[PDB]
């Protein structure tokens, strides 16, 4: 939701074209009283309570809550036997068929989220293998997220990614309350 | 719009077995978008319901209503197509099993009134439908006699049960 920006908008009776004059006098016509042909009642009139402007649904959970969510996702994968640690993501070949056959042989899920430490150093073999696949998705360590971990049946991690996640998520535990944004220099924060 | 009445002439029944009564021929005909009120057409339709083709034509020939001529033309066309296409042996051996009038597509016009006011005229159009069945017209339902009516009353008396008990 926090990224969601609904672009639905409707014209209110003030914004519908025309509708300035009174359709007919108050009394003597024998018809219902009206003040404009663009009121919500009329055909082609405005919308009383419709979607108004591009609306944002932005809200931020506490960073501790989000880190705890990542931790819980990892624990769920491990406890349900969907987490698979690797020494490295190096494949013998870039053929997607090899990766699919390996997953099927190892009884992995229909969808595999492979994770590597950094985007730049991701092996060319795995890059080629996953660029052509749809249910096998390769992401950097910084891209791990609960939604993707849940969408993908199995989560494949490497040892350096495991260390990275451990450090990053454990820091939130035992970190001070911020004095200022952690982007700014700190005594010991990279 | 719907045009099922025309399609009703295209149904083909399976061949009849030798030991089966001869199926009377049925011919469906209609005229669409007649400049006439369906309410006025209904009287002519009802008049000709259940009558032989010749009797209906004779009655219509001497009726002053405009719809009478149109119905006579439709009946003549139905007779012609029954003889030519539906294998009806005799022209006169046909009776109007069904005759009805339906609402057509009507146009809206304006009638001007006395004080800048108006009404909405409807240029009324009507459809006309006929089904011609081969064979003599079915005999009119005889009025129920005193004997039959008393028989019905006695049947009602006998049907009585001891209600609301074992």
């Amino acid at each position: 939701n926090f990224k969601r920006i609904s672009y639905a908008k409707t014209k209110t009776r003030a914004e519908v074209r025309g509708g300035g004059r009174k359709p007919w006098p108050q009394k003597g016509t024998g018809r219902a009283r009206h003040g404009s042909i663009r009121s919500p009642l009329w055909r082609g009139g405005g919308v009383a309570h419709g979607p108004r402007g591009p609306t944002s649904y932005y809200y931020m959970l506490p960073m501790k809550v989000r880190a705890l969510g990542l931790k819980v996702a990892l624990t769920v994968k491990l406890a349900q036997d969907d987490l698979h640690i690797m020494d490295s993501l190096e494949l013998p070949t870039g053929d997607p068929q090899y990766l699919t056959e390996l997953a099927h042989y190892r009884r992995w899920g229909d969808s595999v989220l492979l994770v590597d430490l950094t985007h730049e150093e991701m092996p060319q073999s795995i890059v080629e293998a996953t660029s052509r696949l749809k249910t096998f998705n390769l992401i950097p360590a910084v891209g791990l997220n609960v939604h993707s971990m849940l969408k993908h049946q199995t989560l494949v991690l490497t040892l350096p990614t495991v260390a990275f996640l451990e450090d990053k998520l454990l820091w939130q535990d035992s970190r001070y309350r911020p004095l200022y944004p952690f982007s700014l220099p700190y005594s010991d924060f990279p | 719009i719907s045009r099922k009445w025309e399609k009703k002439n295209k149904i083909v029944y399976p061949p009849q077995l030798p030991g089966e009564p001869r199926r009377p021929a049925e011919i469906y005909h209609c005229r669409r978008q007649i400049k006439y009120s369906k309410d006025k057409m209904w009287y002519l339709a009802k008049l000709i319901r259940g009558m032989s083709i010749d009797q209906a034509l004779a009655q219509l020939e001497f009726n002053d209503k405009k719809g009478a001529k149109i119905i006579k033309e439709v009946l003549l066309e139905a007779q012609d197509m029954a003889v030519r296409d539906h294998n009806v042996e005799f022209r006169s051996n046909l009776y109007i099993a069904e005759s009805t009038s339906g609402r057509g597509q009507c146009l809206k016009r304006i009638r001007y009134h006395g004080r800048g006011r108006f009404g909405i005229m409807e240029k009324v159009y009507c459809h006309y439908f006929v089904k011609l069945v081969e064979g003599p017209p079915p005999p009119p339902e005889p009025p129920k006699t005193a004997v039959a009516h008393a028989k019905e009353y006695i049947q009602q008396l006998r049907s009585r049960t001891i209600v609301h008990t074992l």
């Binding site: 009394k27 | 146009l107 016009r109 108006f118 909405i120």
Partner: peptide, 19 residues
């Protein structure tokens, strides 16, 4: 006072429609 409501004319196309 004299209370008069002018007649309202309906749009012409509605009654001028044709098949």
């Amino acid at each position: 006072k004299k209370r008069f409501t002018p007649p309202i004319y309906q749009p012409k196309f509605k009654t001028e429609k044709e098949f």
